[PDB]
Amino acid sequence: GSSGSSGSEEDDEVVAMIKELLDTRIRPTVQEDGGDVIYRGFEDGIVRLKLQGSCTSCPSSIITLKSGIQNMLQFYIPEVEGVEQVSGPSSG
């Protein structure tokens, strides 16, 4: 709900992969916590994700799971390098 466009910019075997690991227990997992991770765009490894979570539920946990996840991706997919929050609050 914003523009409308079924299908991505020509999905590859690399993406199809990330997507999975993203669908596995990443996207359906975040929600459980508090946020919606949507991988939209992939460059320099940095997978463009539009996630958003308010409930920090302590940092340790975040740096434990939150960060832990970022690792999982790289671990499995040697392609990606980092993560980013595409589309977020930030003016100055």
UniProtKB/Swiss-Prot annotation:
Q: What does this protein do?
A: Iron-sulfur cluster scaffold protein which can assemble [4Fe-4S] clusters and deliver them to target proteins.
**GO BP term (any one):** iron-sulfur cluster assembly
Question: Lyase: present as a keyword of the record?
Answer: no
Q: Which GO terms describe its cellular component?
A: cytosol; mitochondrion
Keyword line: Cytoplasm, Iron, Iron-sulfur, Metal-binding, Mitochondrion, Transit peptide
Subcellular compartments: Mitochondrion; Cytoplasm, Cytosol
Oligomeric and partner information: Monomer and homohexamer; the apo-NFU1 is a monomer, while the holo-NFU1 is a hexamer composed of a trimer of dimer that is probably linked by some 4Fe-4S cluster. Interacts with HIRA and EPM2A/laforin. Interacts with BOLA3. Interacts with HSPA9.
According to the UniProt entry, its GO molecular function terms are: 4 iron, 4 sulfur cluster binding; iron ion binding
Q: Where is this region: NifU?
A: 18-86
Q: Which residues bind [4Fe-4S] cluster?
A: 55, 58
Name of the protein in question: NFU1 iron-sulfur cluster scaffold homolog, mitochondrial
Q: Which residues of the full protein are shown?
A: 163 to 241 of 255
Q: Recite the lineage of the species.
A: Eukaryota, Metazoa, Chordata, Craniata, Vertebrata
The answer, when asked if Cytoplasm is one of the entry's keywords, is yes
- Tell me which family the UniProt entry assigns to this protein: Belongs to the NifU family.
Chief place of localization: mitochondrion
